[PDB]
């Protein structure tokens, strides 16, 4: 069929120092798409991980053509934008709807646990929803490999969004993956109960983190999360990476498994 390579771009979907990401709507099918462009070794690693990618709560990458020096990445277009902008601030969104997004946050962390790739940077920006308000886990360009021939690679890089980063990667050299995301998508949670985020960071010097280590839940964001929520969080937001609870353990809380949403 002539003319079916051809895509419109239509409007900016995001614009930073990577580049800018447009909405493409091609000129005879009009599917709409998400294209990536960029103006070398990272954008390598980046579409290398990309074509990994195939869970329905993750965004699915098509392909990627050069032209010059400019890369463009089509990828899987979310028309419902981030879970950034359903959250109220001092409010955060009905319960029922949080933790229909945190079980859907659960399957794409899970599935990206299972094929050795970690995210490194999970928060209400990089979580996007779909027509139907299904969860995509975007933006892989800080992700990386840390199981690959059923061998572990611990990390060292600092990388991430500091009110959403564990604690370890403030305090230790090296620290294993899966407790990073998984802390990650805690604070995710409480700010869609709480509608605000805890702490600026988990360091001893920052007074929202100890005041939570010393179990001040009559404080906010804590006093407005109800006491089974709560109690995930609690068991999320454990300081010590090795006694935090794993994603297996959360698929067994009580909050986790509890009937909320029609």
Same mark, same amino acid.
């Given at each position: 069929?002539?003319? @079916?390579?051809?895509?419109?771009? @239509?409007?900016? &979907?995001?614009?930073?120092?990577?580049?800018?990401?447009?909405?493409?709507?091609? /000129?005879?099918?009009?599917?709409?798409?998400? !294209?990536?462009?960029?103006?070398?070794?990272?954008?390598?690693?980046?579409?290398?991980?990309?074509?990994?990618?195939?869970?329905?709560? @993750?965004?699915?990458?098509?392909?990627?053509?050069?032209?010059?020096?400019?890369?463009?990445?089509?990828?899987?277009?979310?028309?419902?934008?981030?879970?950034?902008? %359903?959250?109220?601030?001092?409010?955060?969104? #009905?319960?029922?709807?949080?933790? /229909?997004?945190?079980?859907?946050?659960?399957?794409? !962390?899970?599935?990206?646990?299972?094929?050795?790739?970690?995210? /490194?940077?999970?928060?209400?920006?990089?979580? &996007? &929803?779909?027509?139907?308000?299904?969860?995509?886990?975007?933006?892989?360009?800080? =992700?990386? @490999?840390?199981?690959?021939?059923?061998?572990?690679?611990?990390?060292?890089?600092?990388?991430?969004?500091? #009110?959403?980063? =564990?604690?370890?990667?403030?305090? /230790? %050299?090296?620290?294993?993956?899966? #407790? !990073?995301?998984?802390?990650?998508?805690?604070? !995710?949670?409480?700010?869609?109960?709480?509608?605000?985020?805890?702490?600026?960071?988990?360091?001893?010097?920052?007074?929202?983190?100890?005041?939570?280590?010393?179990?001040?839940?009559?404080?906010?964001?804590?006093?407005?999360?109800?006491?089974?929520?709560?109690?995930? &969080?609690?068991?999320?937001?454990?300081?010590?990476?090795?006694? %935090?609870?794993?994603?297996?353990?959360?698929?067994?809380? %009580?909050?986790?498994?509890?009937?909320?949403?029609?």
């Amino acid at each position: 069929v002539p003319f @079916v390579e051809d895509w419109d771009l @239509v409007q900016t &979907l995001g614009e930073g120092a990577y580049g800018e990401v447009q909405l493409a709507v091609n /000129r005879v099918t009009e599917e709409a798409v998400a !294209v990536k462009i960029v103006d070398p070794e990272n954008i390598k690693k980046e579409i290398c991980i990309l074509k990994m990618l195939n869970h329905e709560n @993750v965004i699915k990458f098509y392909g990627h053509r050069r032209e010059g020096n400019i890369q463009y990445l089509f990828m899987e277009l979310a028309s419902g934008g981030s879970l950034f902008d %359903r959250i109220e601030p001092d409010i955060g969104m #009905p319960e029922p709807d949080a933790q /229909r997004f945190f079980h859907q946050l659960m399957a794409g !962390v899970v599935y990206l646990h299972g094929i050795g790739i970690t995210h /490194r940077d999970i928060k209400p920006h990089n979580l &996007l &929803l779909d027509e139907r308000d299904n969860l995509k886990i975007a933006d892989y360009s800080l =992700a990386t @490999v840390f199981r690959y021939n059923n061998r572990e690679r611990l990390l060292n890089k600092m990388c991430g969004t500091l #009110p959403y980063v =564990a604690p370890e990667l403030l305090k /230790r %050299r090296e620290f294993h993956a899966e #407790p !990073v995301d998984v802390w990650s998508c805690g604070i !995710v949670l409480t700010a869609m109960l709480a509608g605000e985020l805890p702490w600026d960071q988990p360091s001893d010097s920052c007074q929202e983190y100890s005041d939570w280590k010393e179990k001040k839940t009559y404080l906010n964001p804590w006093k407005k999360i109800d006491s089974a929520p709560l109690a995930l &969080l609690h068991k999320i937001l454990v300081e010590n990476p090795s006694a %935090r609870i794993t994603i297996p353990d959360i698929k067994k809380d %009580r909050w986790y498994n509890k009937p909320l949403k029609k």
